[PDB]
Amino acid sequence: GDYDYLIKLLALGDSGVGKTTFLYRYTDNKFNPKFITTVGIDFREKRVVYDFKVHLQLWDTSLTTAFFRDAMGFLLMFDLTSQQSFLNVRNWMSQLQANAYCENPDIVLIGNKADLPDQREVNERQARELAEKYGIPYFETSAATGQNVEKSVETLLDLIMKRM
Ligand SMILES: Nc1nc2c(ncn2[C@@H]2O[C@H](COP(=O)(O)OP(=O)(O)O)[C@@H](O)[C@H]2O)c(=O)[nH]1
């Protein structure tokens, strides 16, 4: 423990895609909360109610902002075996840009579950184009195998190190 930079990367994408497994494979056992408190503003009032006097609280229908907080690079991720998750990239990208530190931060496009060719619904060309539309690297990965799992974070880190 004698380094020089501490930098934050965010993985974002639909449930299933392999974020949890991807990181887990890229890292190895780190079940450790970083933590703070969180607000829950709620109104209150002191009603009287004969059948007593009741005080009562009034709640209503967050952390998201706290996740994109400081995130200097993004792993935009989908499931190669799911045409649906590929389409949702359009939408994770939207709320990414809305929350990030900058309008175009550093994203690497990750197609995961590359080890399931039999179950594929997303083609190389498709992704490559979206990637280029946005103008960012693309990586076909597997959390199961390790395919490109490192190269993808590394291409990300390498990018977030362009300064001035
Ligand atoms: N074969 C394969 N399975 C995967 C891969 N990534 C995730 N999975 C599986 O997908 C399921 C859910 O993915 P998980 O990462 O845990 O949830 P997520 O973080 O929301 O994407 C688990 O049963 C994993 O075994 C992959 O790259 N290859």
One-character DSSP codes across 3-57: -S----EEEE--TTSSHHHHHHHHH---------------EEEEEE----EEEEE
CATH 3.40.50.300 fits 1-163, yes or no: yes
Beta strand pairing call for 53-58 and 43-48: antiparallel
Q: Please report, for residues 37, 71, 124, 125, 163, the alpha-carbon distance to residue 105 in angstroms, rounded to integers and kept in the order given.
A: 27, 9, 23, 23, 13
Q: Can you give the three-state secondary structure of 60-108, one letter per residue?
A: CCCCHHHHHCCCCEEEEEEECCCHHHHHHHHHHHHHHHHHCCCCCCEEE
Taking the CA of residue 15 as reference, the ligand 1 atom at the shortest distance is: 20
Length of the chain: 164
- The answer on whether 2 is annotated among ligand-binding residues is no
Task: Quote the distance between the C-alpha of residue 66 and its chain's center.
Answer: 12
Domain range summary for the chain, segments of one domain joined by +? 1-163
Spatial CA neighbour of 90 closest among 107, 73, 71: 107
CA atoms of 149 and 147, how far apart (whole Å): 5
Task: Give the mutation target among 17, 21, 140 for probing the ligand 1 site: most ligand atoms within 8 A of CB.
Answer: 21
CA atoms of 44 and 47, how far apart (whole Å): 10
Q: Which one-letter amino acid corresponds to residue 159?
A: L
Q: Residues lining ligand 1, CB < 6 A?
A: 15-21, 112-113, 115-116, 142-144
CA atoms of 104 and 135, how far apart (whole Å): 10
- Helix axes of 19-27 and 149-159: crossing angle, nearest 10 degrees: 90
- Helix axes of 124-134 and 83-99: crossing angle, nearest 10 degrees: 10
Residues forming a β-bridge with 79: 112
The DSSP H or E segment spanning 139 is: strand 138-140
Tell me, in Å, the resolution of the deposited structure.
3.2
Experimental approach was X-ray
